[PDB]
Write a protein that binds this DNA or RNA. Structure first.
Ligand SMILES: Nc1nc2c([nH]c(=O)n2[C@H]2C[C@H](O)[C@@H](COP(=O)(O)OP(=O)(O)OP(=O)(O)O)O2)c(=O)[nH]1
Ligand SMILES: [Ca+2]
Ligand SMILES: [Ca+2]
Ligand SMILES: [Ca+2]
Ligand SMILES: [Cl-]
Ligand code: NA
Length: 328
DNA sequence: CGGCCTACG
DNA sequence: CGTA
DNA sequence: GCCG
């Protein structure tokens, strides 16, 4: 009754099993820190199944038949239901390894492989990194410089102000170009770690070269603290004005041709797990290859022409889910 | 047993 | 590798 | 870790 892929079922933002899902997500995160993407995926999928249930799980029995629940995930839920705590989860939480890998991977520009190397070298704190700036890329230096602000959740007021300044720069760069808010905010979240914008133009090809012109206009207005610079994606840090001051905010900008807009909108709206599951479903169940540019039939060697996200869902044989039900 | 999303910067 |  |  519970479909196996997250893209086959609605997942609302508010759900009924946060305690259980948070515990499984700890184990998922720790599996990633140890280099097991497969165990990460299973524990994420099991946590996501719980977010899709209509009611709180109160008894072991209620897991029977659910996909992605086997002996390990079931034992974790068992222990939480019976004792309010799972020893394995608590051991991970309080481990030096987990706490330090979380601290380091939370830096913009630092992933698991980098964090693990630094951990093996004996580094433990952000101060330790700042004292060895030779080990840092320019992206990491920016992430570390602005780490305090980047740890502060971005709210909706920040989004609306950011969208106004992005729209102004986009309109100055190319008349008729548009800006669409994507990411978690489009799914209905009230906070995020960054703001995501998708930029296009209704006339195919007019958007070529647009992102450098936007970035230059934002940089000239003093709004850019960091960006990597032809390009179509920018993972930036913006100097966002605040009353009497400013704060650093992570902003992602993507430019796509309008032919690709539905695919880019779907991909960048997420969630991360929802999109990996949708791409897996497409390839493994339907034989079609999905990305943020298109949906390819490798036997006909043709791309599906979609005018909306709904068209993509329909072509994949899936019930349509609005963004606020993609919170897998 | 092997697979596990995707590709741009 | 990073985005993640 | 779970599944095809
Ligand atoms: N984080 C992440 N996002 C991914 C991945 N693959 C993929 O297509 N995306 C898409 C879906 C996300 O909604 C979109 C933007 O990334 P994001 O981390 O800002 O996601 P979010 O807005 O839901 O998160 P947040 O700001 O609320 O923390 O990128 C991936 O592996 N990780
Ligand atoms: Ca990081
Ligand atoms: Ca975001
Ligand atoms: Ca983002
Ligand atoms: Cl694994
Ligand atoms: Na099972």
């Amino acid at each position: 009754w519970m479909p196996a892929y997250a893209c086959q079922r609605p997942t609302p933002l508010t759900h009924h099993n946060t305690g259980l899902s948070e515990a499984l997500e700890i184990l998922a995160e720790a599996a990633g820190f140890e280099g097991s993407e497969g165990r990460l995926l299973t524990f994420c999928r099991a946590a996501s199944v719980l977010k899709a249930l209509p009611s709180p799980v109160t008894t072991l029995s209620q897991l029977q038949g659910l996909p992605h629940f086997g002996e390990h995930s079931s034992r974790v839920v068992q222990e939480l239901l019976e004792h309010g705590v799972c020893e394995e989860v608590e051991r991970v939480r309080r481990s030096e390894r987990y706490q330090t890998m979380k601290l380091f991977t939370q830096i913009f520009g630092v992933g698991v492989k980098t964090a693990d190397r630094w951990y093996r070298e004996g580094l433990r704190t952000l101060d330790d990194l700042r004292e060895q700036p030779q080990k840092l890329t320019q992206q990491q230096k920016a992430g570390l410089q602005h780490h305090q602000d980047l740890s502060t959740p971005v709210l909706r007021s920040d989004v609306d102000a950011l969208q106004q300044v992005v729209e102004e720069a986009v309109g100055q760069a190319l008349p008729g170009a548009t800006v669409t808010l994507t990411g978690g905010f489009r799914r209905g979240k009230l906070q995020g770690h960054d703001v995501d914008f998708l930029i296009t133009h209704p006339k195919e090809g007019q958007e070529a070269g647009l992102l450098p012109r936007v970035m230059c206009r934002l940089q000239d207005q003093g709004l850019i603290l960091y960006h990597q610079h032809a390009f179509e994606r920018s993972f930036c840090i913006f100097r966002l004005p605040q009353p009497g001051s400013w704060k650093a905010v992570r902003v992602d900008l993507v430019v796509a041709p309008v032919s690709q807009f539905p695919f880019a909108l779907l991909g960048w709206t997420g969630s991360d797990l929802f999109q990996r599951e949708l791409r897996r479903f497409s390839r493994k169940e339907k034989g079609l290859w999905l990305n943020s540019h298109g949906l390819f039939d490798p036997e006909q060697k043709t791309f599906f022409q979609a005018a909306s996200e709904e068209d993509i869902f329909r072509h994949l044989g899936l019930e349509y889910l609005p963004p606020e039900q993609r919170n897998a």
